[PDB]
Amino acid sequence: KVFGRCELAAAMKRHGLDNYRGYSLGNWVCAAKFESNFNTQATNRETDGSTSYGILQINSRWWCNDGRTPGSRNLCNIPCSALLSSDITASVNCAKKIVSDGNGMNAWVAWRNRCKGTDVQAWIRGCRL
Ligand SMILES: [Cl-]
Ligand SMILES: [Cl-]
Ligand SMILES: [Cl-]
Ligand SMILES: [Cl-]
Ligand SMILES: [Cl-]
């Protein structure tokens, strides 16, 4: 599923991400835009041979199991393929664990490089929320 910007904002808000660990909704929408282009089916191999999955590009090195990332963990207790669903529940729940892990949203490289410090509120402008 390719989410609309506001559609995703509304879903993320419903799931409790707005100001979760102090991160306003626009941060999460911005992260999803640059991680997956709002596409739940997005998969990308990373430099370390791990793979990132879904709307928020949850990564197989620590967070989900894909059966092909050596030495990895599965801290969200989920197959990575289950993070490609049109239903964002599993990704959101895993994201809540990640963002509570100590380094906040810096865990998402694309957030650090493209969203952090920017006018992220622009990402929810126009949305009925
Ligand atoms: Cl957009
Ligand atoms: Cl915001
Ligand atoms: Cl593995
Ligand atoms: Cl599995
Ligand atoms: Cl933080």
Swiss-Prot record:
In the egg white and polymorphonuclear leukocytes. It catalyses: Hydrolysis of (1->4)-beta-linkages between N-acetylmuramic acid and N-acetyl-D-glucosamine residues in a peptidoglycan and between N-acetyl-D-glucosamine residues in chitodextrins. The keyword Hydrolase applies. Disulfide bonds join 6-127, 30-115, 64-80, 76-94. Gene3D superfamilies: 1.10.530.10. Residues 1-129 form the C-type lysozyme domain. GO terms for molecular function: beta-N-acetylglucosaminidase activity; identical protein binding; lysozyme activity. The active site is at residues 35, 52. Substrate binds at residue 101. Pfam families: Lys. Its EC number is 3.2.1.17. One of its GO terms (biological process) is defense response to bacterium. The keyword Chloroplast does not apply. Keywords: Allergen, Antimicrobial, Bacteriolytic enzyme, Disulfide bond, Glycosidase, Hydrolase, Secreted, Signal. It is found in: Secreted. One of its GO terms (cellular component) is cytoplasm. Lysozyme C is capable of both hydrolysis and transglycosylation; it also shows a slight esterase activity. It acts rapidly on both peptide-substituted and unsubstituted peptidoglycan, and slowly on chitin oligosaccharides. Monomer. Belongs to the glycosyl hydrolase 22 family. Lysozymes have primarily a bacteriolytic function; those in tissues and body fluids are associated with the monocyte-macrophage system and enhance the activity of immunoagents. Has bacteriolytic activity against M.luteus. This is Lysozyme C. It comes from Gallus gallus (Chicken).
